[PDB]
Structure formats: structure tokens, C-alpha cells
């Protein structure tokens, strides 16, 4: 017998599981459409050179990579943002801005544990908008998706911060700019306190510079940030604008400030955010931020402002299961056409044709079955209606219909 289990760390989606995934994706698509984002896609296979950022990111550390027969370094994408940037850079001058693009790529990782190696990740990005209205819209989109799935602001929130605060603190200490990305990557690991301080020292930062970083991540309000860097610091004005705009849109209860949020990606320059459950039970539900320099690093002759997020398919489902918002969605079909016997099969097919022409989902019983077994089958597939095509009714230009006693119905009136 062949191996029935899927490849290590990968999921199968038989129909039952697929209906769940589809319920989730319906919301991602519908939210994107509500917010005016355009779908795109790109190959799961990208050049490895695309992901070499040299900041010690977990995402680059766990690349699912391999060498082609031709000898080229490729990888199954660990994330989508670089692919997006490649596409944007390809279009160059011909891309109309602003652009709002989304996708739901499967993304990949390798880990030596004998644990998940793939997930699907909703990506939403806004390109060509300098102002915080982008981040506002993005955070609202994430909340909208969660609310659409049945969650409330009692269940979840979005923690919001700006990396510009830390930038200034690190830059005031005399640390070269190139160290800033590594610092964010290290400080993201705070969620072992001694080991984080140790890694920062290896980066070449003295104890007092580490102290200033620690203190600023522990400041619990925007006013406290204001005391440290000033009320007219870019981060303060922008964070204030952000919260004012989310409040105006009606999602104020969903969002809050948290100075410890930095995210683990090298490329965020400004506002960063992540979704979380209010019970403190799960990892991040989604994550994102502004990354205004990425396209410049890729060689764009002009700077292109970008912001966006990723929203995974695994943590959200666990949360929905906990909150009892993922009831089993059973299969449905409008009609099941039942030939009384094989001599009625041709007539039954004409009926089936009609039903499908009118936009109805319909089965016909394919093998030889007795009527009552055909009826049981109809119930198993969740048919709303059984349509028995029997010789007596057929001579009267009729069929028998039963909603799941029967009724005789003219053919013309079935649809």
C-alpha cells in the first residue's frame, strides 16, 4: 500500500476540511472586494536571492529551498511581500498609484522537527500612499474580516506601534542605521529577557543603549512616548492620526497602542501592528506594517511607499473553534433527480438539463438504485429537493417533487 499520509508538515483538504477553508477564504475575498483591493498572484517558486536580507530573520532562517537540475538556487516562498515587490518593480512607471493589491498564497518553511511547513496567508497591501490612511485602511480590513467571521472586539484586538520611536532612540545613541533592522529582529524576540539583551550586545550596542531600548518598549501610552521624544515627533503625530481615523470609521474598540510591538521582519520603517486574542491564548492572528524602503533596496530609482499585512489561516481557525464559530458546514445541493428505473434515465437527464440551465445545483442518481435508497442518498448530500421521474407522471408532462409526501409538478414549473 502507498503512503496515505501527506508529506511531512503538509495538510490534506478533503471536502469537509475544504468547506472550512473556503468559508475562511470567502471572507478574505469578500473583505478585499468591500475594501477595493485587486487580486494578484505569482509563482510559489521564486529565486532564493529574493529572500537574502542578512538581518537574522526567522523567515530567512527557515527557508524551504533547493537547487534545480540546472543548478539555480530557488525556494518555495516563505512570504509574499518580496514577490509583490518584484511585480511592482517590473511594472515600474506604468503602474497607476495608488494600488491596492491582495492575494491568498500558500507559503512555506522548512524546520527540522521530525512542525507545520505550509500555511495559506491572506496578503493585503497598499502601494503609493505616504500617509497613515493606508495603515488605517489595512487595520480596518483585518478587523472587518474578523468581524465577518463572527468575532467581536471583546474577542480580539490589534496592537499598534511605530518603529520610528525606537529608530530615534537607537539613532540618538550613535548606532549606525544598518544596525536598526537587526535591532528590531532581536527585540521582536522579547515576547527571554536575558538572552535578548545578550544578542543586542553581540550587535555592538553598549548597556546604556540597551537600557534605553528596554525602557521605551515598556512605555504604556502615547503620552508617555510624547514625554520621551516630543509631541511633534513623527511617530506621535502619525499614531494620533491613525487612532483618530480608526475611531472615525467606527472600529476604535478594536485597536490599541502597545510599544512592545515591532514585528520580526527587517523591512518595516513605520507603523507596525498585529492582531491578538483578548484571552491571551494564541499566537498572532495577523501582522503587518509600513515598509517604505523595500522597493528602494530592490533597485527602484524612486522610493515607493508601501504598507500591508499577512493574515494566516491556522491561528484564526483555532480561535474560531474555541469561540464556537466554526460549526460544520454540511454539503448542499438544490435538486436530486431520481430515475424511477433505467428506462426513465433519458427523460431524467432532460429534466436535469433544465434544472441546471436555470442556475440550480443538481445531481442525478448515476448508478442503479431503488427509489428509497436514492432518497436516502439525497438526504446524505443535503439536497433541498428530490425530483422523481416516473413513467406515469411523465405521460402527464409531470414529475414528482418532495421537499427534504410528494407532489406532482409540471415540467415547466420546476424552475
Ligand X SMILES: N[C@@H](Cc1c[nH]c[nH+]1)C(=O)O
Residue nearer to ligand X on the CB measure, 151 or 265? 265
CB of 106 to ligand 4JN, least distance (A): 9
Residue 196 binds which one of a copy of itself, ligand 4JN, ligand X, none, with CB within 5 to 8 A depending on kind? Answer: none
Cβ burial of 301 (10 Å; 0-12, 13-18, 19+) is exposed
With binding defined as CB under 6 A, does residue 59 bind ligand 4JN? yes
268 marked ligand binding residue: yes
CB of 321 to a copy of itself, least distance (A): 20
CB of 74 to ligand 4JN, least distance (A): 16
Residue 378 binds which one of ligand 4JN, a copy of itself, ligand X, none, with CB within 5 to 8 A depending on kind? Answer: none
Q: Are 185 and 61 in contact (CB under 8 A)?
A: no
377: β partners: none
Q: Which residue has the cell 448530500?
A: 381
With binding defined as CB under 6 A, does residue 352 bind ligand X? no
Residue nearer to ligand 4JN on the CB measure, 21 or 119? 119
Give CA–CA dist 70/93, Å, rounded.
33
Cβ burial of 280 (10 Å; 0-12, 13-18, 19+) is exposed
**Whether the bond into 98 is cis, omega within 30 of 0:** yes
Near ligand 4JN by CB under 6 A: residue from 46, 57, 118, 238? 118
Task: Give the neighbor-by-neighbor strand order of the sheet with 45-47.
Answer: 45-47, 73-76, 64-67
> Judged by CB under 6 A, which stretch of 6-14, 200-208, 303-311, 377-385 contacts ligand X?
303-311
CB of 242 to ligand 4JN, least distance (A): 26
Residue 73 binds which one of ligand X, a copy of itself, ligand 4JN, none, with CB within 5 to 8 A depending on kind? Answer: none
Q: Of 19, 30, 271, give the one whose Cα is nearest residue 165.
A: 271
245 marked ligand binding residue: no
Near ligand 4JN by CB under 6 A: residue from 28, 37, 101, 108? 108
From residue 34, alpha-carbon distances to 37, 133, 153, 387, 400 in Å are 8, 16, 20, 38, 43
CB of 209 to ligand X, least distance (A): 27
DSSP, collapsed to helix, strand or coil, labels residue 308 as strand
Cell of 80: 509574499
127: β partners: 99, 306
With binding defined as CB under 6 A, does residue 78 bind ligand 4JN? yes
Helix boundaries (H) for 68-132: 81-91
CB of 219 to a copy of itself, least distance (A): 27
Q: Which residue has the cell 512592545?
A: 260
**What does the DSSP assignment read for 281-297?**
-SS-SEEEEE-SSHHHH
Residues 6 or more apart whose CB falls under 8 angstroms from that of 94 comprise none
Near ligand X by CB under 6 A: residue from 88, 104, 219, 265? 265
Binding-residue total with ligand X (CB under 6 A): 11
CB of 94 to a copy of itself, least distance (A): 10
With binding defined as CB under 6 A, does residue 313 bind ligand 4JN? no
With binding defined as CB under 6 A, does residue 57 bind ligand 4JN? no
Binding site for ligand X (CB under 6 A): 79-81, 123, 125, 265, 287-288, 308-310
Residue ranges for the known binding site for L-histidine are: 79-81, 109, 121, 125, 263, 267-268
Amino acid at each position: 500500500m502507498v503512503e496515505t499520509e501527506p508529506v511531512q508538515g503538509c495538510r490534506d483538504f478533503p471536502p469537509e476540511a475544504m468547506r472550512c477553508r473556503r468559508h475562511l477564504f470567502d471572507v478574505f475575498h469578500a473583505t478585499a472586494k468591500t475594501f477595493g483591493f485587486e487580486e494578484y498572484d505569482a509563482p510559489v517558486l521564486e529565486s532564493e536571492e529574493l529572500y537574502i536580507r542578512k538581518a537574522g530573520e526567522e523567515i530567512t532562517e527557515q527557508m524551504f529551498n533547493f537547487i534545480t537540475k540546472g543548478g539555480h538556487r530557488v525556494a518555495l516562498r516563505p512570504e509574499m511581500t518580496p514577490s509583490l515587490a518584484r511585480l511592482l518593480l517590473g511594472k515600474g512607471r506604468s503602474l497607476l498609484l495608488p494600488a491596492k493589491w491582495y492575494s491568498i498564497p500558500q507559503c512555506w518553511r522548512y524546520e527540522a522537527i521530525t512542525r507545520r511547513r505550509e500555511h495559506y496567508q491572506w496578503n493585503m497591501d497598499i502601494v503609493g500612499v505616504k500617509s497613515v490612511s493606508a495603515e488605517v485602511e489595512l487595520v480596518c480590513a483585518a478587523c472587518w474580516a474578523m468581524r465577518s467571521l463572527g468575532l467581536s472586539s471583546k474577542d480580539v484586538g490589534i496592537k499598534v506601534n511605530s518603529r520610528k520611536v525606537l529608530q530615534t532612540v537607537v539613532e540618538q545613541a550613535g548606532v549606525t542605521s544598518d544596525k536598526f533592522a537587526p535591532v528590531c529582529v532581536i527585540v521582536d524576540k522579547m515576547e527571554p529577557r536575558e538572552e535578548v539583551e545578550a544578542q543586542l550586545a553581540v550587535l555592538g550596542l553598549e548597556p546604556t543603549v540597551v537600557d534605553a531600548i528596554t525602557t521605551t518598549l515598556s512605555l504604556k501610552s502615547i503620552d508617555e512616548i510624547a514625554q520621551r521624544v516630543g509631541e511633534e515627533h513623527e511617530a506621535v503625530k502619525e499614531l494620533r492620526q491613525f487612532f483618530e481615523q480608526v475611531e472615525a470609521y467606527g472600529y476604535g474598540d478594536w485597536v490599541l497602542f502597545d510599544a512592545s510591538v515591532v514585528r520580526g521582519l527587517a523591512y518595516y520603517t513605520g507603523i507596525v501592528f498585529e492582531g491578538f486574542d483578548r484571552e491571551g491564548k494564541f499566537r498572532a492572528l495577523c501582522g503587518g506594517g509600513r515598509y517604505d524602503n523595500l522597493l528602494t533596496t530592490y533597485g527602484s530609482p524612486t522610493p515607493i511607499p508601501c504598507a500591508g499585512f499577512g493574515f494566516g489561516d491556522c491561528v484564526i481557525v483555532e480561535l474560531l473553534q474555541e469561540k464556537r464559530l466554526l460549526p460544520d458546514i454540511p454539503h448542499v445541493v438544490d435538486d436530486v433527480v431520481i430515475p424511477f428505473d433505467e428506462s426513465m434515465r433519458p427523460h431524467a437527464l432532460a429534466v436535469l438539463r433544465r434544472l441546471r440551465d436555470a442556475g440550480r445545483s443538481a445531481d442525478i442518481i448515476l448508478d442503479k438504485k431503488k427509489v428509497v435508497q436514492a432518497f436516502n442518498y439525497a438526504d446524505r448530500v443535503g439536497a433541498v429537493r428530490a425530483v422523481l421521474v416516473a413513467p406515469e407522471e411523465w405521460e402527464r408532462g409531470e414529475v414528482q417533487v418532495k421537499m427534504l409526501r410528494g407532489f406532482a409538478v409540471p415540467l415547466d414549473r420546476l424552475v
